[model samples]
Target: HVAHPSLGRGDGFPFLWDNAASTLDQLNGTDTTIILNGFNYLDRLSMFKTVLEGTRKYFDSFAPNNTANIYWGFTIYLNWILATGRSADPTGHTTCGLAHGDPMCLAEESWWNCIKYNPAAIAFFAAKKAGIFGDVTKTIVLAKPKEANSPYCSSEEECQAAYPDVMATYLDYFEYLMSLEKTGESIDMDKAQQLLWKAHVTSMENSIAVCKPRLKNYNIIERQLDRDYLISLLYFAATNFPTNFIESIKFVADMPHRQLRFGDIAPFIPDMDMKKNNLLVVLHGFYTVHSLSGGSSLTHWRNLMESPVSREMARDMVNLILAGTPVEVQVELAKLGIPTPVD
Candidate 1:
């Protein structure tokens, strides 16, 4: 959550804050959902420490097991929306370029940061800017993973390791399409763009898989929610707005007008600067550690808590990694009903 320092300008914010405290004071209900934003992971550690203290105090006043009575349904935002978004920022991180990075040595933003890294990844942006990938704007959208293992792995390392072929394929196909765009005198830009879109959507899932590793202590639901949000970001990226079109007696996905530029594509991605309205629910589950990865499901959460974390702020560091995990170049392109590579 980004701090709304604007709230300090002396509105009835204090009064509202007091009123909310008063409201929580009277609440005996356990099934509560607090919608928190503006309190990003770093900003809210002290805030959470403070809030957790308050809850502890409240529980102490009420009953010894009050904390356990209600299954807390709390949700909040992290600094970055997805893993890929973290690569661009250099806030609390010791290493920002790649590797020694959280969850693994590489990240999505860095992977897609250049044409040298992944061609299809950047080409999608280029084509989008050229009014080609979208045919105009909405010809492609991300879809759900075709298979469970296709999106899940043990860690960021495993995630990346799982699909060298996917990345290679993306680069090769992208080069082929560009070759056509450059060399062919009568190349069909329309069909070429269509194939490019499919190539993008098909391989995008590999990035999603990169982020959905089964970390040390994270439970099924926690991991699923992560993937869910990952997929959602993909969804937003591929088709957050109108992807329809109109021609003479024909309804199509492309529109010739209102095309954007290359730089425009970055800002358009929700993960670049995740917003509260569009971001997905981040559950209370903790982030997984690599050493914690490849472990059996039989291990209890308490034991998993003993797993290693690099930063002094163990949980905070994990949260930071998860926030950035979705900031990559790949996504599920099939959900919006686009042509897939297999199809």
Candidate 2:
């Protein structure tokens, strides 16, 4: 939610002020086929993905295109539409509610169908869809740890600890693709642009409620989880958008793009000016103390509560983090540098 002060008239525009939609929101209703109440995790990496996955992988192990042993998150399905042009399904997320038969499954089906045809919906579907989120997704599928103390790693941490390698593999594959692009392999510029479009969808979600304050208290872990997700999103927008996604949020994401140069904070604040001020910092820093990465030095970050709307946002973010985050997730936050809550 970067606010520019005046567009020539000094009126800063907060472009991403409305993106808090759960990619999985569509998975409810009588017709809802997928069930998420008891399944593996879901990663909402894009809009179409967020929708389709909720439908396809709701309650059971996700199966993409009938492919077994792998379940991409809600974000992945959006990418499928990006790669192709059809809907993940047709009914859309118009689930009537849980009163109908198989309400949850209907909900997911409706969810997947909802984003298939709209113009905005089509854009994300055209670019990157979704991938095996972490290298670990495959490993988890293979190991299928049956018990808490099976010979396989014993702890969830042991399972998640392997994520770096998986993520590394993700990056390596991306780089390999980039190498091909540089060597004259024709890349689909449209799909590349679609990547940017998908990114905007992801940003929209982060903008809505990535850093609510009051929520952080009940579930310090969820607060950090949102932060980490947003951090990665910011970087992806900056790096992958230009050619790949045709700079979906270029001038917008990099609002004060031209003025800034480099500094020690360069690694952290890639583009910093006065506009970096947003409620996310305050929500992460004050009530929850669960987020601390790039905005610590900004005065606005420290003083976000000075504004009324921002204050409310802080409360919502706080409530979300505190109430929804699980204890196991909280431990992961500790590892990510989010501090424990204070009195």
Candidate 3:
């Protein structure tokens, strides 16, 4: 049997330190597989190492048998502008310049830009891909846009115009990487990276064309594209790493947004062995509320964790996943206090 424990926190936050100990305490000397989800901020090399070391230490003392079987979920945030909000724009525009100024409005566009072009980032991921840190079994990719909201586009025409630029960003980045001199270690790495990127780009192109007219809302189109992107990446993983088994691709969302429901992503999912490879949709309400509170204060974390209702909600959610039953999206929506729509 497997136990999936989802934790959401950033590098600087103490959520892991506070919760990991308690969480690990519960599963001592068990044969259950532990798949950790909601590691949304594992972008930096130092942070990754810290998580590796810290978790290993915790498991060694608390849950030894579960250590090697632990899988850490990694995320690549795609939507830059919507995620950062108006604060990222220097002009102090109210709408974060999405209404008038550039769509690439973030101050740094850190991960989005770095993942595309940064050599160090490339090397870090290449190391992971080559089992330099650990085998593929130890890691799970969480397809995320960082923020729960959809991309901002003023109109359909603007949304259409914005896609080519988005496509070009990937195309240019891929071309630049291809032009670089490949060392013996990186030769194979390049191919794997290219395959995944190609799948992502192709899916985006196809999804935008298909979802735009049907969805009619640019925001919703962007949301669906995120699902399509994950599906394509899953396809890539299945094809490339046939030997490595990933139990599920957990798509993390801040809220139980109807746009991000399993039904929406279901059609795009490739025909594959569902018993071995599954899709999981997680609603991270606590993390979302904390993020909106402006700062990651200890008080905020304490209050959220201290709340009986919140704790109960978390337990129920995690247990629901562990039960291995089909999730009824509307029922879950009702439980989350979301108004269910009539069909």
Candidate 4:
């Protein structure tokens, strides 16, 4: 998993390295290399922003209808990208699996796994679930709909309050780590916190036009009245339960490689010490922001046009909990619409 090269290169638009680099300082601990499942919905938003906004800019620079050219070009190139070696399109022309199998199979060295839901992603999920869905223990307080699109809580804010219980719990865990005994003597705790603030400050001031736009938690609390209003509602009632909460909650993929099972460990693991060839099931929602649209290489341009929005949304959902913003606000902001993050 962690050893896999795809962890770095295969997921989403490949520009996510930028997200990893952007938040590196705020992250605790060493082993600086990034693995997959570190980012969530932001990754997808970055991709779509690259595509939709790119269409608006690149082709629109010439004409608004360039959306069509961008769309179709994106479509054909995407077809070539995703469809390379998978089908019986027996013109028998070589396409995707170019690096792997018979001319029939795509041989290109490509790994098809999505980075959205792996172990690290699950921990992020777990942290929220610990605080949100049920509790750190994951007992159901409210019933989740059995139908796939079952009606959810009317607004995202309502949802966030329900879950912060879990996020608060995770904060405790992180605090516990930071609170390790006598470990503080040699560690420059104040300097470390200051450095964390420094990286965030730089990202705030330097985030580029191509980067995905998101509300720095306080912005939404200030500008968007409804969600922020709800936070106030909760805060008044919770009696200042917790303060100085982190504005952004990054989903960290703690493992080398893994898969994510949706809210279940049905194939229950009886132990953590065992190692086997079986796939690890988990994911964390963290990500990078970057550009993949340039270059003379046809594949590079094609990859740039796709958006892993589902992954991006998942990350946003998690961030909403960690940030303590309303979930409705999370979805709205993630769409990259105006009156939202307001780049």
Cα distance off (Å), candidate 3, residue 157? 40
Model 4 over residues 265-307: C-alpha lDDT tens digits? 4114443212211112111100001011121222321232233
Could you give the candidate ranking by TM-score, starting with the highest? 3, 1, 2, 4
TM-score of each: 0.26, 0.23, 0.27, 0.20
Q: Which ten residues in a row have the lowest lDDT in candidate 4?
A: 282-291
How would you encode candidate 2's per-residue C-alpha lDDT over 143-187 as one tens digit per residue? 133334322222234423432333233233334334443586544
lDDT of each: 0.28, 0.29, 0.32, 0.25
Off by over 4 Å in 1: 1-85, 88-164, 181-183, 186-192, 207-210, 214-226, 233-343
For residues 136-227, write the lDDT of model 1, one tens digit per residue: 32222222222355332322234236555544444443344445436644433333333433444445554544533332123343334344
Worst 10 residues of 3 by lDDT: 239-248
lDDT of 3: 0.32
Ranking by lDDT: 3, 2, 1, 4
lDDT of 3 by residue, 27-122 (tens): 223343322221122223232333344334323443443233122223112222123331123324233324464442332222222222222123
Leading candidate by lDDT:
3
